[PDB]
Amino acid sequence: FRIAQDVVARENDRRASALKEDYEALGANLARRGVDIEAVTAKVEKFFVAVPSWGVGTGGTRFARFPGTGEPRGIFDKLDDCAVIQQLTRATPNVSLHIPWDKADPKELKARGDALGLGFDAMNSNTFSDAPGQAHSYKYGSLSHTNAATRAQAVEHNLECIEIGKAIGSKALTVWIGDGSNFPGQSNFTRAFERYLSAMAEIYKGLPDDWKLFSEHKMYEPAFYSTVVQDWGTNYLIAQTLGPKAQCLVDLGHHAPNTNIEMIVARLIQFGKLGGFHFNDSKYGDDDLDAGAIEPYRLFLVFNELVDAEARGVKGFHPAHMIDQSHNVTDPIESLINSANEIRRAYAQALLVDRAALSGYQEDNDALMATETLKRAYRTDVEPILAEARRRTGGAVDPVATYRASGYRARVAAERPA
Amino acid sequence: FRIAQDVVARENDRRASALKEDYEALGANLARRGVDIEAVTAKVEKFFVAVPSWGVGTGGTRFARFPGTGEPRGIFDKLDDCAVIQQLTRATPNVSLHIPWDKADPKELKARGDALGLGFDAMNSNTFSDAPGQAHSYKYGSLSHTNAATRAQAVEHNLECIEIGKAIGSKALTVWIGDGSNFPGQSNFTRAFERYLSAMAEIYKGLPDDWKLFSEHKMYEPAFYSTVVQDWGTNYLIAQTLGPKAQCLVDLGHHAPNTNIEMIVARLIQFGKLGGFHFNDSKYGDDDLDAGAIEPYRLFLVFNELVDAEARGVKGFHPAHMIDQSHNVTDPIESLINSANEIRRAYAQALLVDRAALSGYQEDNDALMATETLKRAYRTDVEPILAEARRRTGGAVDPVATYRASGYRARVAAERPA
Amino acid sequence: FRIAQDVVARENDRRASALKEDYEALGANLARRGVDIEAVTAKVEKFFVAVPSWGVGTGGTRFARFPGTGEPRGIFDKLDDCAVIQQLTRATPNVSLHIPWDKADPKELKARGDALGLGFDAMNSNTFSDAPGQAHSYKYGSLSHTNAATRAQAVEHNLECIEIGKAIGSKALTVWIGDGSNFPGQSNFTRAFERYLSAMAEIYKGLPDDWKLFSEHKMYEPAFYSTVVQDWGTNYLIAQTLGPKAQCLVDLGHHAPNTNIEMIVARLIQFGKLGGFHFNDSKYGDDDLDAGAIEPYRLFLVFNELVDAEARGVKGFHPAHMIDQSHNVTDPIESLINSANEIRRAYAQALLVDRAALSGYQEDNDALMATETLKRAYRTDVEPILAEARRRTGGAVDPVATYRASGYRARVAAERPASV
Amino acid sequence: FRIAQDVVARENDRRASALKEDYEALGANLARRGVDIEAVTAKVEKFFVAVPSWGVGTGGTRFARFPGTGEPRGIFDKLDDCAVIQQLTRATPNVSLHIPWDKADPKELKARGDALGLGFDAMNSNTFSDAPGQAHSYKYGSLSHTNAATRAQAVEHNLECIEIGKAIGSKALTVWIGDGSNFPGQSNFTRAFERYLSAMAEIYKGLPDDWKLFSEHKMYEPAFYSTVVQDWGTNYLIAQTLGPKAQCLVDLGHHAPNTNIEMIVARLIQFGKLGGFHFNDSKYGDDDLDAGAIEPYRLFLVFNELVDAEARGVKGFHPAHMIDQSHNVTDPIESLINSANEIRRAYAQALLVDRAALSGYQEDNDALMATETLKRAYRTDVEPILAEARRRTGGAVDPVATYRASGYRARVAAERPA
Ligand SMILES: [Mn+2]
Ligand SMILES: [Mn+2]
Ligand SMILES: [Mn+2]
Ligand SMILES: [Mn+2]
Ligand SMILES: [Mn+2]
Ligand SMILES: [Mn+2]
Ligand SMILES: [Mn+2]
Ligand SMILES: [Mn+2]
């Protein structure tokens, strides 16, 4: 165990009394509202979100990167750190890998994962940067590059990601590329998209039937004029064109200012193309900040659509959940811990919505009560439920407090080169 | 003739020598660039854009409306004013009607149009406002309203618009509604969209074999939280679901901040669902300003996509263009005149792009020369072409100057009581 | 009383048990956090926000207006409705008037206000629309219009607003105009601003010693290319130029997409130019939606800056608080009630922030714990505190539910003629 | 001469005939508008904009950097490339240095500059990144950092920049920092600003009597929640607080979506705090794209304000203009060349505005004719003037064409490492 069990027990005992008081109080409040707190905690204990291997190390901007102490070197150190997040929150049993950054012996990866109590989520291909010894540069694109050999190289790389994923237990390939243009006229919009579609079709041919192929849209960056997979509309066309196993991945920070993202989620669900989510928060662009740190209500509204879907009985609805963030000014482990917590927080609150009451207010066009019905759920402080779920499943009542009391950061700082 | 022919002749002849000088100078320049000015002028003469009947009246905001003199009241006054725009620019032969604002005896409407030299473009339904004696209010929606009777009333109204259009020569119905919500939870996104699709399917059934049904997306306003037909993504789902006769209308000012609109145009063209483009300009929201008055280059880039499709062929490409603006601080006739001019200006410049050279630079990923190739066309002052095209077709060399010299505004001001 | 006391009493009794349980539970939780819930409730029950007279009637857009039943006939009906909001929430004792919309004999306005237990907040001038009989139109501007006589007309109107306010107990004038341009070149940015500053100085000259002049910036609408008072930068230049009695009014929905509004608030406070707030919520533009219905955290963050001002010891800081919203698809009274509630909600949460802990995390650059410190306050459900504050002050535990139980809307619907 | 004079001559003679024709044609056109093309050309030959030393190297994003061949290594290589831009465009005689990147013997820099025919513009400090051996990290800020020792280090660095500038002929220091926060609560907005103002006051004390101190605002990036110097309002407070020698720098891509940037320019000029303008273009955020490649009209409108200032007779107005761009997918030298050209293009068009006619239309509130007055200037293709201006001053008629014909890139690619 990355974190000593005695430290976990000690820090849980220190806060056990208060938690009992808060949990029983919330339990009584919920019972008065016709909700069984135990039913909610039971569901919360089953909600999982994948952590990004590339998010365990300190992130940076084009201006600078300010690493902290004990930075993980390689995927093995990263898995060790991810193990801490799972142990304390119990909400991140799976890790999402990025190739070639995390390329290593599949048997070893799988072996280390099993030892750490971690599984592997969707693989992530990388054709938005050049690796050492690469034959063709992705400077002007990859899967949609004008040069056939470059597209071929990109397709092969993606197929390799599938091979690695199959060996470790992954069940999906997420494809996000920077392909686009920085100048009007640089790219022929339609021809570029045609090349992309043809390349993805080749990747789709190599996709196992138990896998999903996720395409991720993004309005801009690295391309600053146009992007091939720029929004959910183009993304839908891609998924629909490719096949039943192809779906769209929605990253919260990849939309134009003021976009109603939760509606995008609902539309994709209605047409069976909501592959999964990339959680994070933002205020200006693709800021990649800790989930819920900027607009917690928006996060709740997205989950409201997810919970409504299940309520409406949508079949085969098992969207993938992943955190896609960059931690530039905090301890990556702490941020991922609290981000995973915020995701479960939004989910739990969405579970509290009185669906029957809401349905009634929507049908009668009682906008005020309809919105207040959502607010009654959102305003509820579900921390006691989150903390109890962790406590009952081997985690920490207060993950960050236990993390800091363990001295893990100082430990790995002493074991890893500065 | 709304404007005395002798006035047009007079104003044109005084400027004839100057125009000839500019036309010949530009011709020599285009000749050196391997372009035949005559070929461009010929195409410009045949580019038309519909004028909205409601556009000749002074517009306003929710804060106030400041009418000018001689305001047209009713469709008859409006057609009289629209006739001026066509006579002077020769780029707006067809008018788009709005029901019930323009309700009148179909035979009278058609007779008046024929007399003024005006045809009728797409009909526009109105279920975003309540008419006197209306059985059900559209306060909470229309085609997507939760009340079955309300949706039925909206459907019948649209069918009635088709019946009126059939009687006057129209071949399409444009559907733009305000349907949406101002509060989270007020509407169930998916159910509202399902209701909308079901209602539109009924309207689709009353569509003659040679008619088209256009759905128009808008991010927000009048709904300030969510809008059923909020973007081109939803618009595409609508058109594809309804059938071959259903297409999407792209209104420039209806997109989120920083949206790459020309790409949306390309995407719709590729999948055969670009029903038409609604021209106007904007800086903040759906400002409905004179086309090209704010971002003339963006207008050119949209036309670059239209000309590429117009030239390279492309199946199902028969866009029905219309100007959709609000004139709050100018003479509506003058603004529509210059907006129509600006639209032809961007078209003309798009026709100057060296397609072969551009394609070459795109294939070689020569971004700088690709963008410069577009700029060489855009930087060209094609006013001489626009003016000569008008002169050859019965219009005015300088439309606004001629309009002012005619004293038309003062004339209608004396005929119409403020 | 607009709302029968027996109804308020009955609806309060019906919910007494649940409130006791929730309030006492919250109180114990706060105590464990070193917070005295009684101290918080005591401050909450004293937080007031002015209600707009123009907000009690149903609003609309340029596309349409869909009135409900019992729409107020004039200012007197509007005051009657504002009295309902105050009686039930006890958070809106003052009303903001708009001239000429609310023109009437000052003596009578004051008399009705006194009778209903309502006071009057800042006056609001109107030179963004033309009233009957004006010598000059405001189509191309007002205080910054190129025509000298038009600017003078606008100044005199504002001076008249001050006279009305003086007679009814108001102590400030808020100036928001639509002045700007829809086309590049239409206006000379600098000349228009110079004209505006000059005119505003004459309005300032007419201010009593104890009055304030608030200028309100807005990025766009009605002007769609440029606006004379477009942002807080220009607004600061205005207030600083006019004098000590001139301050800036920040309306939440009047900023560019993604603007960090709470920072603007902090900057204005630092330089003593934060006159007050116009509360509302939005997602796209100046949506004028119910406060907190879209981004409740942003509202909390704005209040975090207001409370921090006190924590830093800023002297003579008494910003004016007003709700400026448009209720297009709800009963205006209910939206104003819940908006006032949402404002007290954010204020209450800001009061819960452990300022001592936050200062520490800020100094040592512990960003995660610093943000979590704000969240611990924001995540707290303070509804019990709000409800108790109302109970103690003669209000309703659940304002909207009580309003609906009273049948007030159906009553005024039968009393007021629908416009024809 | 970085570029062989024989090449410049040959490439000019090859295009001299066409240029003569277009120039005379434009001259006749302008004469009819009461404008002497020679007077315009004379002023254009005198318009200069500084080039960023760091702009000649290929830029990148946080995702990747795709360097081209012959990447400059060190300030001396960079000056060699800047010389090419100045030689061919004759519009960029001054270079802006960045410390510590361009640190070198002031005597040698000056000597190399004089030899290349280049001068030096404003110095640029760097406290948005950490350098080796640095005592205190700027991870959590610099001039506004909570740690006094860190702020002192930042101050000393800026003073060092002034000393270096005093030795090479610079007359200003530009200060742009990343200081800000990524999370609500992380920073106290007021305290952070107070710390910044106090640190800047110390830097101001190191300014010679004839120097300027420029502060540059930016809405976001690297800070994603709040930025100390976030907009022009805060920037004004800074300049007004520091003193007469402190002014504001307006970088085009550093504003919120839809911001009216030209108004900000006008406001700063009115209050004497417009230190200078940083040119570039953008569509989404701080894209740092080639000037005028996305919104050429906006660039023209900014120049309309700069030219109006002269027309109004504003005293002591000597703005320090510089190009601040990132060239990620083109040859840096070619982009800077066309960007400088675009800047002169906008300036020239601004000079064509009929100020008398414009003020007349502004006074009578003739919005349509006022905007058309600006458009008459903007629609004028001034390329012949720009080209002739270059030809007469030793530059190239077609800069990029000559640059490519010279083979400079391949040349330095062989002299420099990969
Ligand atoms: Mn992602
Ligand atoms: Mn991303
Ligand atoms: Mn439209
Ligand atoms: Mn519109
Ligand atoms: Mn307001
Ligand atoms: Mn407003
Ligand atoms: Mn800059
Ligand atoms: Mn920049």
Tracing tokens 């006197």 back to the chain, one arrives at B132
Alpha-carbon distance of D93 to D112, in angstroms, equals 13
Q: Give the CA dihedral A264, A269, A273, A277, nearest 10 degrees.
A: 60
CA distances from A97 to A102, A120, A161, D6 (A): 6, 7, 9, 57
Residue A94 bridge partners (DSSP):
A119
Asked if A186 lies within 8 A of B256 by C-beta distance, the reply is: no
Helix (H) or strand (E) holding C119: strand C119-120
Distance from first CA to last CA of chain A, Å, rounded?
Answer: 24
Q: Is-cis flag, bond preceding C222, omega within 30?
A: yes
Q: Rounded distance, CA A110 to CA A105, Å?
A: 9
Helix (H, G, I), strand (E, B), or coil: what is residue C92?
Answer: coil
d(Cα D176, Cα D154) in Å, to the nearest integer?
A: 12
- Contact check, Cβ <8 Å, A62/D62: yes
DSSP C51: E
**Tokens 């909470």 -> residue:** B140
User: Distance between CA atoms of A158 and A214, rounded to whole angstroms?
Assistant: 12
Helix (H) or strand (E) holding C275: strand C274-279
- Is the separation of the CB atoms in C193 and C206 below 8 Å? no
Q: D368 and C183: CB-CB below 8 Å?
A: yes
Give the number of C-alpha atoms closer than 13 A to the C-alpha of residue D342, restricted to the C-beta side.
Answer: 29
Taking contacts as CB-CB distances below 8 angstroms, the residues of chain C near A287 are none
Check the annotation: does B98 bind a ligand.
Answer: no
Query: A257 and C257 in contact by Cβ < 8 A?
Result: yes
With vertex at residue A280, the alpha carbon angle to CA A42 and CA C354, rounded to the nearest 5 degrees, is: 80
Q: Which pair of structure tokens corresponds to residue B152?
A: 């039925």
Instruction: Return the closest-CA partner of residue B271 out of B322, B231, B314, B215.
Output: B314
Question: In the CATH hierarchy, which top-level class contains the domain D1-418?
Answer: alpha beta
Beta bridge partners of A174: A124, A214
What letter represents residue D151's amino acid? R
Residue B232 Cα, gap to closest chain A Cα (Å): 7
Q: How many CA atoms lie within 13 A of A275 on its CB side?
A: 31
What CA–CA distance (Å, rounded) separates D399 from D408?
Answer: 13
Q: Which residue has the tokens 């020698």?
A: D245
Q: Rounded to whole angstroms, how far apart are CA atoms C273 and C251?
A: 14
For the record, the structure tokens of D189 come out as 């907005």
Q: How many Å lie between the alpha carbon of D131 and the closest alpha carbon of chain A?
A: 10
Give, in degrees to the nearest 5, the angle at Cα C207 between C201 and C213: 70
Residue with structure tokens 């499943």?
A: A393
Is there a contact between C130 and C145 (Cβ–Cβ < 8 Å)?
A: no
As a whole number of Å, the CA-based R_g of chain B is 22
Q: Which of D206, D192, D270 is nearest to D238 (CA)?
A: D192
Contact yes or no for D352/D380 (Cβ under 8 A) = yes
Cα-flanking dihedrals φ and ψ of residue A364, to 5°?
-90, 5
SS3 of residue C281 by DSSP = strand
**Amino acid making up residue D22:** D
- Identify all chain A residues contacting B364, using CB atoms and an 8 Å cutoff: 146
Contacts of A6 (CB under 8 A, 6+ apart): none
Among candidate residues D185, B200, D127, A177, the one with its CA nearest the CA of residue C368: D185
D 109-148 near A (Cβ less than 8 A) = 128-130, 137-140
Q: Which chains touch A (3 or more CB pairs under 8 A)?
A: B, C, D
Supply A413's token pair.
């700082």
Distance CA D285, CA A217 (A): 18
The H-assigned helical ranges of C125-231 are: 148-168, 189-205
Dist. CA C34–CA C11, nearest whole Å: 33
Q: d(Cα B146, Cα B144) in Å, to the nearest integer?
A: 6
Token reading at D217: 């605002």
Bridging pattern class, strands B180-181 and B226-227? antiparallel
Closest partner residue to D224 among A182, A219, A283, by Cβ?
Answer: A283
φ, ψ of residue D164 to 5 degrees: the values are: -65, -45
* Cβ atoms of D20 and D408 closer than 8 Å: no
Complete edge-to-edge strand list for the sheet that includes strand B246-251: B123-124, B172-175, B212-216, B246-251, B274-279, B322-323
Contact between C117 and C83 (Cβ < 8 Å): yes
User: Is the peptide bond preceding residue A100 cis, with omega within 30 degrees of 0?
Assistant: yes
Helix axes A232-242, A189-205, angle to 10 degrees: 40
Show the tokens assigned to D240. Answer: 């007004």
Q: Amino acid identity of B259?
A: T
Whether the link from the prior residue into C417 is cis, omega within 30° of 0, is no
Instruction: Provide the number of CB pairs (under 8 Å) joining chain C to chain D.
Output: 152
| Cα end-to-end span (Å), chain D | 24
Q: What is the CA radius of gyration of chain A?
A: 22
Among B260, B301, B367, beta carbon nearest to A230: B260
Amino acid symbol at C141 = G
What count of residues does chain D have? 418
The Cα–Cα gap between A204 and C71 comes to 61
d(CA A84, CA A409): 11
* D293/A184 CB distance under 8 A: yes
Give, rounded to a whole angstrom, the gap between the first and last alpha carbons of chain C.
Answer: 30
Helix (H) or strand (E) holding C274: strand C274-279
Of residues D64, D183, D290, nearest to A128 (C-beta): D64
- Nearest CA distance, C241 vs chain A (angstrom): 32
Residue B121 and residue B174 in contact, taking contact as beta carbons nearer than 8 Å: no
Nearest-CB residue to B128 (from C64, C128, C287): C64
Single-letter amino acid, residue C358 = L
Burial class (CB within 10 angstroms; exposed 0-12, middle 13-18, buried 19+) of B253: buried
* Cα distance between residue A241 and residue A247, in whole Å: 10
On whether the CB atoms of residues D325 and D289 are closer than 8 A, the answer is: yes
Q: How far apart are CA D341 and CA D44, in angstroms?
A: 10
Pick the CATH number of C1-420 from 3.30.200.20, 1.25.40.10, 3.30.70.1710, 3.20.20.150: 3.20.20.150
Give the C-alpha separation, D89 to D86, whole Å. 5
| Beta-bridge partner residues of D289 | D281
Q: Which ligand is nearest to the CA of A277?
A: 1
Q: In chain D, what are the domain boundaries?
A: 1-418
Angle between helical axes of B399-406 and B332-352 (0-180°, round to 10): 160
What is the SS3 assignment for C311?
helix
Q: Where are the alpha helices (DSSP H) in C210-258?
A: 232-242
For C179, the 3-state DSSP assignment is: coil
Strands of B51-52's sheet in order across = B51-52, B94-96, B119-120
Burial of D418 (0-12, 13-18, 19+ CB in 10 A): exposed
Q: Which two tokens stand for residue D166?
A: 């005093």
Largest CA distance in chain C: 67
**How far does the centroid of ligand 4 lie from the alpha carbon of residue C57, in Å?**
27
A328, A56 in Cβ contact below 8 A?
Answer: no
Find, among C292, C302, C196, C307, the residue nearest to C242 by Cα: C196
Contact B350, B301 (CB under 8 A): no
Which residues in C227-242 are b (16+ Cβ under 10 Å) and which e?
bbbbbbbbbbbbbbeb
Q: What is the DSSP string of B276-318?
A: EEEE-B-SSSS--BPTTSS-HHHHHHHHHHHHHHHHH--TT--
d(CA C91, CA C86): 6
Task: Name residue B6's amino acid.
Answer: D
Report the relative pairing of strands D51-52 and C320-323 from DSSP bridges: unpaired
- Taking the Cβ of residue B297 and every Cβ of chain C, the question of whether any pair is shorter than 8 Å is answered with no
Specify the pairing of strand D94-96 against strand D51-52: parallel
Sign for the CA dihedral angle at D105, D109, D112, D114 comes to negative
The Cα–Cα gap between B305 and A306 comes to 38
Q: How far is the CA of C222 from the centre of ligand 6 (A)?
A: 10
Question: Is the distance from CB of D374 to CB of C184 less than 8 angstroms?
Answer: yes
Q: Which residues contact C94 (CB under 8 A, 6 or more apart)?
A: C48, C50, C51, C118, C119, C120, C121
B332-352 and B383-392 helices, crossing angle to 10°: 110
D283 Cβ under 8 Å from any chain A Cβ: yes
Structure tokens at C52: 């707009």
Q: How far apart are CA C157 and CA D104, in angstroms?
A: 65
**How close is the Cα of A60 to the center of ligand 4, in Å?**
40
Backbone φ, ψ for residue B274 (5° rounding): -90, 95
Is C255 known to sit in a ligand binding site? Answer: no
d(CA D339, CA D325): 9
- Which residues lie below 8 Å from residue B99, measured CB to CB, with a gap of 6+? B123, B124, B125, B126, B157, B160, B161, B164
Tell me how far the alpha carbon of residue B255 lies from the centroid of ligand 3, in angstroms: 11
C-alpha–C-alpha distance, residues B215 and B232, integer Å: 10
Report how far residue C172's alpha carbon sits from residue C165's, in angstroms, rounded to the nearest whole number.
8
Given a contact cutoff of 8 angstroms between Cβ atoms, the answer to whether C150 and C142 are in contact is yes
Question: What are the start-end ranges of the E strands in C288-330?
Answer: 320-323
Instruction: Determine, for residues D64 and A178 on separate chains, whether the beta-carbon distance falls below 8 Å.
Output: yes
Rounded CA-CA distance B259/A230 in Å is 10
> Could A301 and B184 be called an inter-chain contact, meaning their C-beta atoms sit closer than 8 Å?
yes
Q: Which two tokens stand for residue C31?
A: 């105590």
- Tokens 């200081």 -> residue: D179
Distance CA D36, CA C354 (A): 70
Mark which residues 305-324 of D lie under 8 Å from C by CB. 305, 308, 312
- Contacts with B371 from chain D: Cβ below 8 Å: 290, 293
Pair of tokens at residue C130: 């033309």
Q: How far is residue C333's CA from residue C338's CA, in Å, rounded to a whole number?
A: 9
Q: How far apart are CA B47 and CA B90, in angstroms?
A: 9
Q: For the beta carbon of residue C272, count every other beta carbon within 10 angstroms.
A: 15
Resolution in A: 1.8
CB C256 within 8 A of CB C230: no
Q: How many whole angstroms from D375 Cα to the centroid of ligand 3?
A: 25
Secondary structure, 3-state, chain D:
CCCCHHHHHHHHHHHHHHHHHHHHHHHHHHHCCCCCHHHHHHHHCCCCCEEEHHHCCCCECCCCECCCCCCCCCHHHHHHHHHHHHHHHCCCCEEECECCCCCCCHHHHHHHHHHHCCEECCEECCCCCCCCCCCCCCCCCCCCCCCHHHHHHHHHHHHHHHHHHHHHCCCEEEECCCCEECCCCCCCHHHHHHHHHHHHHHHHCCCCCCCEEEEECCCCCCCCCEECCCCHHHHHHHHHHHCCCEEEEEECCCCCCCCCHHHHHHHHHHCCCEEEEEECECCCCCCCECCCCCCHHHHHHHHHHHHHHHHCCCCCCCCCCEECCCCCCCCHHHHHHHHHHHHHHHHHHHHHCCHHHHHHHHHCCCHHHHHHHHHHHHCCCCHHHHHHHHHHCCCCCCHHHHHHHHCHHHHHHHHCCC
Q: Find the Cα–Cα–Cα–Cα dihedral B395, B399, B401, B404, rounded to 10°.
A: 90
Q: What is the DSSP string of B21-60?
A: HHHHHHHHHHHHTT--HHHHHHHHHT---BEEGGGGS--B
**Bond before D244 cis per omega within 30 degrees:** no
What 3 state SS string does chain A have?
Answer: CCCCHHHHHHHHHHHHHHHHHHHHHHHHHHHHCCCCHHHHHHHHCCCCCEEEHHHCCCCECCCCECCCCCCCCCHHHHHHHHHHHHHHHCCCCEEECECCCCCCCHHHHHHHHHHHCCEECCEECCCCCCCCCCCCCCCCCCCCCCCHHHHHHHHHHHHHHHHHHHHHCCCEEEECCCCEECCCCCCCHHHHHHHHHHHHHHHHHCCCCCCEEEEECCCCCCCCCEECCCCHHHHHHHHHHHCCCEEEEEECCCCCCCCCHHHHHHHHHHCCCEEEEEECECCCCCCCECCCCCCHHHHHHHHHHHHHHHHCCCCCCCCEEEECCCCCCCCHHHHHHHHHHHHHHHHHHHHHCCHHHHHHHHHCCCHHHHHHHHHHHHCCCCHHHHHHHHHHCCCCCCHHHHHHHHCHHHHHHHHCCC
Residue A9: partners with Cβ closer than 8 Å, 6 or more residues away: none
Rounded distance between C-alpha atoms, residue B233 and residue C246, angstroms: 48
Contact yes or no for B38/B45 (Cβ under 8 A): no
